[PDB]
C-alpha cells in the first residue's frame, strides 16, 4: 500500500508553520490530495502558447510535496505561482518576477520559514542564478530540479545556482534515471538525488485520481517536502545548516556510479535523500571544482558557502599530472586552489566545507627543504593538510616531500576532538572515520598518487607502498 | 564594465525582450529613471520600446521589449551592471 518512493525515504526510526511556494503550471487546487492546503496566489506570468494538460504538472507536484495520501510532508501549507503555460513553458523573466513576488509577499505579510520549489530548467542563466542567490541571502530555502537531459547540471538554471538545493532523480532500483539520451542530470552542481521515476501523485484528470509521473522535478519535490518537515521541527535552521543535514541524512553509496560518464563519477554526490530519524554535532561536506583547462598555469577553485568553514583542501587529476593544491585567502574566505602541471589535461580542486561556528581558522605554511608545519598550541586543532610544488616531477603536524611546500589548516575550536587515522597497502586506498566522527581532512602520505578526496566520511586516495591519511573530529 | 548575455542553447533564446540588471546599490527611483532614459534615447532613433516591468527587491533593474540594435546604447546607460536576453524555461 505504501508507494515505493515514500518508503525509500523513510529512515530506520520514525513516527504547517512552514510554507512551500510552487512556481509551475496551473493547479487544480481542489483535488482531494491538496484541497484546502494550496492557496493559488494571484500571480501569473506565462508566455503565449504555440485544460487537463494545463494543470497536470503542477498538480502532481503539489501532490508529491503535500498530498494527504501520497505526499511527503502530508501536513504542508502551499502557495502556487503560475509561471509555466499549458505546454509547460515559461521564461527566465517571468520566473524572476515570480521570485520577486515571493519576497514582496514575504515583506508585506511575513509568515514563518519559506521553501521555494522550482520544478523547471533552462540553460545557464546569469540573472536567474543571481536572483536565486539573493532570495537565498534573504533567508529563503530554494529547491530545484537538476534537469532531465542526462547532462551536466552546471549547464542549466536554476540548477546551476550554487545557493539552491539541486536535486537529481533516482529510480526504484536506486539508480540514476536513464532513458535513451535523456535522464537525470548529474555532476558537481547536484547536491543530492531523490526518488524521481514512477512517482504516484494527484492527477488533474479528476478530483480523486492519481497518476504516476517521472522527472527531476519529482525528485526535487521529495526534497522540498523533506525540507518542509525539517524546518517544522527546527525552524531556526539556516540554509547552510539545512543543506548539511540533508546530505548527512541521505543514504550513502547506493548508486552504482558506472551509470554516470567517467569524468562525472567523482563529482556526482552518491546520496539518495531521506527524512531524518525522529545535542550538537559536526557537519561537513565535500565541494568539487570544475575541471581546469590543460594549460600549465591552469588552476581550479572550490569554495564553501558563506557560513561554512573550509577545513581542508585536496586535488585530483586522473592522469596525475598535477602540482598539488593550497589554501589561500580570497575575499576574506579561505578557498581551495589546485594546480595543473606540464602535459596535464587539467586538475580538480576539492574542498571540505563544515559548519563550525565559535571558530577562527588560518593556514600555516612551510616552504621546501621532508617539509613540516604544525598548529602551535592546544585546543587549536589541525583539520587538514595541503601540499603544492613548483617543480614538475606527528600530532598537529603536516609533512610532505622535500621539494614541496606544505600547508596546515589550523582551527580554534576547544569543543572539538581530532584524531588522525592511517592505512596503507593497488589502484585505490581508503580509510574511514569511526561512527560519530566527521572526516575533516583527507590526504596521501608522500609512490604515485592521482589524488585524494573525501567521500562522506571516507578518505580516498587514488594511485596507479601507498598510505591514506584521515583527520577525524567530533564534539566533546 | 556592462556585459551582455544570451542563452548558449540557441533554440531556447527569446530575442526581443531583455532583462537589464543595474548595479547593487541602485535605488528603485534610479531604476525607473534609467528605464525612461533608455526609452528617450531609443525614440530619438525611431525605435519603439516598452518597459514591461521594473525590478526591485532582489535585483534592481527592468524588463524591456525592444530591438537588439539598442543593446549597445543600453549598455552605456548609467548604473547598468549587465543585460541578459530573455530565454525559455521548461517543466521538469
Amino acid at each position: 500500500s505504501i508507494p515505493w518512493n515514500l518508503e525509500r525515504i523513510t529512515p530506520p526510526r520514525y513516527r504547517s508553520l512552514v510554507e512551500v511556494y510552487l512556481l509551475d503550471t496551473s493547479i487544480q487546487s481542489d483535488h482531494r490530495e491538496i484541497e484546502g492546503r494550496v492557496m493559488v496566489t494571484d500571480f501569473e506570468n506565462v508566455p503565449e502558447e504555440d485544460a487537463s494538460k494545463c494543470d497536470s504538472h503542477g498538480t502532481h507536484l503539489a501532490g508529491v510535496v503535500s498530498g494527504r495520501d501520497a505526499g511527503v510532508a502530508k501536513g504542508a501549507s502551499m502557495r502556487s505561482l503560475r509561471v509555466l503555460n499549458c505546454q509547460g513553458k515559461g521564461t527566465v523573466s517571468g520566473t524572476l518576477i515570480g521570485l520577486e513576488f515571493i519576497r514582496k509577499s514575504q515583506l508585506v505579510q511575513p509568515v514563518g520559514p519559506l521553501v521555494v520549489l522550482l520544478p523547471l530548467a533552462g540553460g545557464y542563466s546569469r540573472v536567474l542564478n543571481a536572483a536565486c542567490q539573493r532570495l537565498a541571502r534573504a533567508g529563503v530555502v530554494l529547491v530545484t530540479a537538476a534537469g532531465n537531459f542526462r547532462d551536466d547540471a552546471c549547464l542549466y538554471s536554476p540548477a546551476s545556482a550554487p545557493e539552491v538545493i539541486t536535486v537529481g532523480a533516482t529510480n526504484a532500483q536506486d539508480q540514476p534515471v536513464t532513458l535513451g539520451t535523456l535522464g537525470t542530470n548529474f555532476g558537481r552542481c547536484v547536491d543530492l538525488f531523490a526518488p524521481g521515476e514512477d512517482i504516484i501523485g494527484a492527477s488533474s484528470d479528476c478530483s480523486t485520481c492519481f497518476v504516476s509521473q517521472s522527472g527531476t522535478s519529482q525528485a526535487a519535490a521529495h526534497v522540498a517536502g523533506i525540507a518542509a518537515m525539517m524546518l517544522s521541527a527546527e525552524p531556526e535552521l539556516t540554509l547552510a545548516e539545512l543543506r548539511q543535514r540533508l546530505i548527512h541524512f541521505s543514504a550513502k553509496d547506493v548508486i552504482n556510479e558506472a551509470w554516470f560518464p567517467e569524468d562525472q563519477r567523482v563529482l556526482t554526490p552518491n546520496l539518495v535523500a531521506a527524512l531524518p530519524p525522529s545535542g550538537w554535532q559536526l557537519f561537513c561536506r565535500t565541494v568539487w571544482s570544475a575541471h581546469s583547462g590543460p594549460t600549465r598555469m591552469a588552476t581550479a577553485i572550490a569554495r564553501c558557502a558563506p557560513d561554512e568553514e573550509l577545513l581542508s583542501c585536496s586535488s585530483f587529476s586522473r592522469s596525475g599530472k598535477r602540482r598539488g593544491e593550497r589554501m589561500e585567502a580570497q575575499g576574506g574566505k579561505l578557498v581551495c586552489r589546485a594546480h595543473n602541471a606540464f602535459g596535464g589535461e587539467g586538475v580538480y580542486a576539492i574542498a571540505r566545507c563544515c559548519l563550525l561556528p565559535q571558530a577562527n581558522c588560518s593556514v600555516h605554511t612551510a616552504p621546501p627543504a621532508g617539509t613540516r608545519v604544525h598548529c602551535h598550541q592546544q585546543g587549536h586543532v589541525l583539520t587538514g593538510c595541503s601540499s603544492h610544488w613548483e617543480v614538475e616531477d606527528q600530532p598537529n603536524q603536516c609533512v610532505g616531500h622535500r621539494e614541496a611546500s606544505i600547508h596546515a589548516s589550523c582551527c580554534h575550536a576547544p569543543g572539538l576532538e581530532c584524531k588522525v587515522k592511517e592505512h596503507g597497502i593497488q589502484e585505490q586506498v581508503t580509510v574511514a572515520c569511526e561512527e560519530g566522527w566527521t572526516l575533516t581532512g583527507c590526504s596521501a602520505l608522500p609512490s604515485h598518487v592521482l589524488g585524494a578526496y573525501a567521500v562522506d566520511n571516507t578518505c580516498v586516495v587514488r594511485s596507479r607502498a601507498v598510505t591514506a591519511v584521515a583527520i577525524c573530529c567530533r564534539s566533546r | 564594465t556592462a556585459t551582455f548575455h544570451r542563452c548558449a542553447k540557441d533554440p531556447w533564446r527569446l530575442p526581443g525582450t531583455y532583462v537589464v540588471v543595474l548595479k547593487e546599490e541602485t535605488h528603485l527611483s534610479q531604476s525607473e529613471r534609467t528605464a525612461r532614459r533608455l526609452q528617450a534615447q531609443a525614440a530619438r532613433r525611431g525605435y519603439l520600446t516598452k518597459i514591461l516591468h521594473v525590478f526591485h527587491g532582489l535585483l534592481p533593474g527592468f524588463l524591456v521589449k525592444m530591438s537588439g540594435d539598442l543593446l549597445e546604447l543600453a549598455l552605456k546607460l548609467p548604473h547598468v551592471d549587465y543585460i541578459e536576453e530573455d530565454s525559455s524555461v521548461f517543466a521538469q
Binding site: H57, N148, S212 | -
Partner: peptide, 10 residues
C-alpha cells in the same frame, strides 16, 4: 503515465 510528455523533454 510513466514519463508523461507533460515533462520536458520526456
Amino acid at each position: 503515465x510513466x514519463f508523461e510528455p507533460t515533462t520536458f523533454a520526456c
